[PDB]
Every structure is written in structure tokens, then in C-alpha cells.
Amino acid sequence: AENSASVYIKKVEARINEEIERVMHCLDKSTEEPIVKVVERELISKHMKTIVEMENSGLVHMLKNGKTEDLGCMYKLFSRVPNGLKTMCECMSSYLREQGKALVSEEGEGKNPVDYIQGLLDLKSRFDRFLLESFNNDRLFKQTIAGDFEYFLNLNSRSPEYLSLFIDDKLKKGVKGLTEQEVETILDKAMVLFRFMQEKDVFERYYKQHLARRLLTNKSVSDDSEKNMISKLKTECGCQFTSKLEGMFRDMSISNTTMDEFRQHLQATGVSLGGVDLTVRVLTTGYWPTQSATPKCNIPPAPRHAFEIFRRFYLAKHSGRQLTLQHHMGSADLNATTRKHILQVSTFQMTILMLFNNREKYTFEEIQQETDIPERELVRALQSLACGKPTQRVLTKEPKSKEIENGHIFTVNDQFTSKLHRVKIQTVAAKQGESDPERKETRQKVDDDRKHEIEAAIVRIMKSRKKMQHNVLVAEVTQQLKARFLPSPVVIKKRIEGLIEREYLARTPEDRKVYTYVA
């Protein structure tokens, strides 16, 4: 009552020290077991409940401000009395839950995922530093913090997505932390944070999407850190999806071999003035998520000739396969022309600009009637070229408005603000919005991925194992997928009974006594 949790610990430590000194110097030889036991049971066992939680700089406040000496002395004092570390870790976990809920709060739009992941990593590093400095690497504290992280991190389904965005931001360019030591430390911290994370399927899917985004754009991002990333993934994930990652890296390798060989062949042929500079790439459908490779749209004449030459070469010297045309990938360099400044089009504005070159003074009807254009990508490209543009506009209009009309004429502005000859319009890859349609479609995709993965596991494992009666093998199949994602009991229960319609371990429900151990 006369003090608080700040100076009371030093006073009680001094009291214990003087009591033990007196008992060892002024009394008999041993004289200490019952004395120290009863002293502890009176002081610590009574002050433990109230001095760490009530108020006025107890345990939570002395940890929030970052008092290392207070934490160290509390750990060294409460370690003598049993059930002290238990409530210490309980209060620490309660504070961790409160901080996480204050940090993982979803109510409110306009949060930066990279900043959120950076703050979470900073909190984790601060707690680890406090543990190392005060708790002397106690196993109980580490277990409690690991459990607390597992408990509060999986509140929102977008946490692995935000981690993937953060790692993409750190990997795209090492502007912050030019040297390699801090990069290595931050990567180690990131993988440590990912260690206490569930739902690895969405994490891998978004990491692969980020790989596709960063490898199908301007190259020479790091050129060395990919090996470090794959090495860390091997030591963290294993050999489940890392092999496919290096496989799509080999796909990139095959692609660049194709670029150089096609350049050589175009030099050999050199028929039309459409292949001045070709940077074509060749990828496989299985590795990269290019299943939506059918935007059927018109191509500008020089790109038309280039694509025709490439297709003829690929059908002549690479027989046995056919190519598919698409527009939702790649880029281009448009040489405009007082100086000759070269623009940049990401294969979205090429058709509209080519139509403008053929005839100016067009509108929405002109670019929607004689071009065979899709719906959503048309709107996105039109908005990128016209709406929300800074003072470097390359496609202006007379009806200045936010919403898109039908009868609006398109013009072009000089905009000499570009100080170089290579000016690009990077309207794509804007602030991470993660809209509802894309989130829903990727959630459906990952749900189907899990639904096929569980079937693959059950047909790969149960062929060499025993049979189940009611719920025997489901425990094993969930344990094998414990480190992957949630067991989802209802989903697996509904899916295991769908294979009974045909052969290959039909798993008859009525005849569940024995299962068909055949093929």
C-alpha cells in the first residue's frame, strides 16, 4: 500500500539478502531452508497476484515503456517461488493479445500492408530483445509468446497476403539497406515471423503471384537475392512448392534463350519492318498462372508482323505445339516525337494508340466497335490513360470529368516536364487495394487447390496404410496437413464421401469394416 511495483522489488530483494546474511552469520550452519521457504511464501506468494496487474506501473506498464532492468529483476526474483513464471507469462500473453488486437484491427480502410508488417516485425524484435536481455532465454516465455503469435496472427485471412506484399517490397529493390548484412538480418526476421504463421497455401500462392509480377516486368531487380530466397524457402517450406518455384525460374531461363534465338532468326530473315526490336518471352501454362490467356484483341501492324514471324518460326522449327495470343502481360516502348521522347505501353494502350495513329478524334464507341475489346480491362486501361493523371498526360480529353462517358474526344498533350527520353506511365501496380472480386476469385482458387491437395494426399498415403472405421484415418490426414492449413473437418468429411461413386478405393460407407486395397 505504501509503494508500487517499481521500488518494492528492490526493497524485498534487500530484505531477503539481509535476512539470509543474518541467518548464515548469526545462526547455525544450515538454518535456511524453512526460513527462506516461509519468507518466500509470505512475501512473493502474496504480492504475486496484485503487484503485477493492478495499476501504477505494474508488469504491463513497466513492459510497455521498455524497462529492461525491471523485467530482469522481476524474472530473477519470481524464479525462486513456484507458480510465479506461470502468472508472469499469463500477464505477458494478455498484454501481447491486447497489443495484437490493437494492431491487427480490421475496422478501417486505408492501412499500408508494408507498414503493418514492419510494425509487427518491430514488435516481435522488441519482444525478442526483451526476452534475451531479461528472461535469459527461458523456455516457458518462448512457448507462451509463440502460442500468442499463433493465436492472434490468424485472426485475419489477409495476414499471409500482407507478408507476401512486404517481402515483395523488400525484394523488388534494396534501396533501403544497400549493404547485405542488414538485408540478411531482415530476411531472417521475416522468415522467423513466418515460422509462427498458419495457412501456408495462400502465402505460397501470393508469393508465386509476386514472382510472376516481378519477373514479367523490368528485370535486374536484385539478380542474386533469388538464390537466397529459394534457399530460405527450402529450409522453411521444404520440397513441396519450392521445386515448382525453381521450375518457373527455369521457365524464365528458357524464355530468355527463346528471346536470343528468335532475335538471331529475325536477323537471319529480316522481311518486314515490324521486328526492329523484339523482346518476346515463352512460358508454360502449368507453372505461371496464365490460364486467362485469351483476350482476343487486334494488334498494331508492326506488332502484327512481329507476332506472325514469331509464330511461323515457332511452327516451323518448334513443331508439336501451338501458341496462344494474349494482351494481359508484357510491355512496350513507344517512340514518340521539340524532341523524340519514347513512351511506354504495357500492352494495354497499344491498340488504342495505334487506332489514334490511324485516325485521330475517336471516342468510346470507336474504341469499342471496331476493335473486339473485353469489358473490364478496357475500362481499366482507359482510366489509366485518361483519369487520375498527374501533369504528364499523354491522352487528354475535352469533357474533363471523373466518370467515363461515351461521346468524349481524345487528344494528346506535349507535357515537356519529362527531362529524359525514356518516360513511362506506371499507372499499374498502384497502392495495394485488394478489391472484393480479385480477393473472392483467389479465395475460390485456393479453396479448390486445398480440395485437390487433400484428395492427392489421401490417395497417396492411404494406399499403403490401414483402414478406418469411423474417424481413424482422418486424424492422420489432418496431422499430415497440420503444418499446411486448417483441417476443415466439414470440408474433408464432405469430400471423402464423393469418391464412392466409382472404383479406386470407393470407401463404401455401409461396408466400412474393410476397404478395397486394390487399384
Binding site: 526490336d277 523482346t279 515463352v282 508454360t284 501454362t285 506488332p303 519514347i342 500492352t347 464423393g498 461413386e501
Partner: protein
């Protein structure tokens, strides 16, 4: 002209022998069920039969290729070992 394209950085996609008109295993189609499914609704619960894609870019029904995993699995359209790289067309 006012705007002339200098460089183009397209990406080309390709497949080995998917045969959209026919599953090389079942010879019905790349879509529209398989030999062991027949009726589309029956008792299917959203028709779990999907299209399986391997590292060898060959496409069959997931049911078509699941029956071949028991015996030799060498992707009989080539010598590559069959994998599971994509589900759904």
C-alpha cells in the same frame, strides 16, 4: 507518323498436345465429363471432375489421369513423368 513502336516485350504461351476436342485418355473432350462420369448431374455435387494439368503441359480430366497413377505413370503422350501443376481450365 506521330507514334511509332520501337520495342515489344510480349510473352507467348504454349501447350504440348492438350487436344481440346478430345481427352487423350478418354477421347470425349477436354471438358464435358469423362468415360466414368457420363451424366453431368447424377450424384456429383458440383461435378468434382476437373481438368488436370501437368508439368508437361498435357491436359486430361483429373479422373482420367488419376486412374493411370496406379500403374506406370509416364504421361503416355511423352517420356516426362506426370505431375500436378494446375487444376481447372
Amino acid at each position: 507518323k506521330r507514334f511509332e513502336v520501337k520495342k515489344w516485350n510480349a510473352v507467348a504461351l504454349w501447350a504440348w498436345d492438350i487436344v481440346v476436342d478430345n481427352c487423350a485418355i478418354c477421347r470425349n473432350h477436354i471438358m464435358d465429363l469423362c468415360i466414368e462420369c457420363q451424366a453431368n448431374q447424377a450424384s456429383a455435387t458440383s461435378e468434382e471432375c476437373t481438368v488436370a494439368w501437368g508439368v508437361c503441359n498435357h491436359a486430361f480430366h483429373f479422373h482420367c489421369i488419376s486412374r493411370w497413377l496406379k500403374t506406370r505413370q509416364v504421361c503416355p503422350l511423352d517420356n516426362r513423368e506426370w505431375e500436378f501443376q494446375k487444376y481447372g481450365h
